[PDB]
């Protein structure tokens, strides 16, 4: 039941970079929302 297989792996890290949004909330409210911008643009629309 053992065979070598050719797999398509990652080779580097992912990235996560703040925006100005998350920087200001981290400064003033001690906190971070992940996906604050994608979150906000879908906040008021139908597809929440």
């Amino acid at each position: 039941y053992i065979s070598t297989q050719v797999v398509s792996a990652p080779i580097s890290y992912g990235h996560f970079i703040m925006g100005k949004e998350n920087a200001v909330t981290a400064i003033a409210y001690r906190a971070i929302m992940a996906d604050f911008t994608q979150f906000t643009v879908n906040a008021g629309t139908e597809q929440q």
């Binding site: 996906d35 994608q38 979150f39 879908n42 906040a43 929440q48």
Partner: protein, 48 residues
Amino acid sequence: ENWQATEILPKIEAPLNIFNDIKTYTAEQLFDNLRIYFGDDPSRYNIS
């Protein structure tokens, strides 16, 4: 701890995160913070 972010805010679907029932998990306290309500709690709305 606030739960209304979970109650309201945008969510990302996940397929088959639990193969097993979460009834046992809730009833026998697998978790650290859980909030459960049967009837629909209208306290999701007083956003102060």
